[PDB]
Structure prediction request, 404 residues.
Amino acid sequence: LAAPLKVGAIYTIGPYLFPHLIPQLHRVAPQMPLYIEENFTHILRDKLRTGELDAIIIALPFQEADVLTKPLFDEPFYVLMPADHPWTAKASIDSELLNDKSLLLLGEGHDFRDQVLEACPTVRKGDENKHTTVESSSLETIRHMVASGLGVSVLPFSAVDSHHYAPGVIEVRPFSAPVPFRTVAIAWRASFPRPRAIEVLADSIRLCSVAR
Amino acid sequence: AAPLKVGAIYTIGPYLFPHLIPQLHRVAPQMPLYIEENFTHILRDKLRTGELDAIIIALPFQEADVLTKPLFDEPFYVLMPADHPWTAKASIDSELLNDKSLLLLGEGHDFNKHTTVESSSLETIRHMVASGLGVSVLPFSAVDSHHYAPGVIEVRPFSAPVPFRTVAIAWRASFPRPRAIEVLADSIRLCS
Prediction:
């Protein structure tokens, strides 16, 4: 019939974007079906090179040969802590306090620093990988871990309120300004035979927030 | 004061864990849970090495020196486009589902040439069915895990016999915390 659009996304974006995005796309433009995939950045990129995926949705920085990049939107990071942990007193958190082993972060796509990548001068803080690298590919795992009170972590804005914990066992606090953020952008091959699909995708993504 | 590493397959986990774990934090705050979603063979392989302490799988399943307890039986339902001929029915006989119209995952879910969808997510297949590229079969836990407006995706039960999967729990018989495993499996039974 009509060609489908094979779209990929990282684990820190996919589960928290697709189940809301895809139906809207099906509504405004059912002309194209979407083939949903969730994976890591490198394998996603490799699937983009081999044409297995038409386009991917990843967080900047992202620079690959013969691949275009349209910065879709800016997503701010919030912090997640158990109900007991004293940092509930603060209504805003210093970015440095998250540099002890209390912080839990996935191996790929979860780190909220050094991908914010400022274009002004940055202070090279002598760097301590002083956090725990959880070898999981799901933010929900760390959500449960922190909810138990086994540590604290950082979540993108899309993810924070996507759980079934009764209010007051896991709690989210906003950063102290300036707030750290990732730039959710779309990547697709140069000379991709169907630019219109890329435009429809990008547009429908950018306006996913607008209620109906 | 000790972490219990639970696992589950991709067609069971996503529709169980988010409700299951807050329950096991509610009745068992003494124990932190480390969940993980993966394939059957790799879950078994991780249970053999102790990287996981328990796994929530689908029968039939059997592994050396590993106890199996059938937690519950979960029926299947036919996922179809809003504009299917099958919409004007009360049920669907099991034989009707053999075609390239039937979208099934591997590993995923089973009952012979169909259309195998090379994904680990039932959601991909769901969106495919919404788009209208044939029908599929979803467990009871998945049939409502979407945000599609009514009149886009229709679900229809089977006519007897109703096919189902026996969701069970598996853990090493050498495991020194059978009480914890019992509480876990019990809570899994509760959220069904």
Notes: The first helix of chain B runs from residue 17 to 26. DSSP finds four helices and nine strands in chain B.
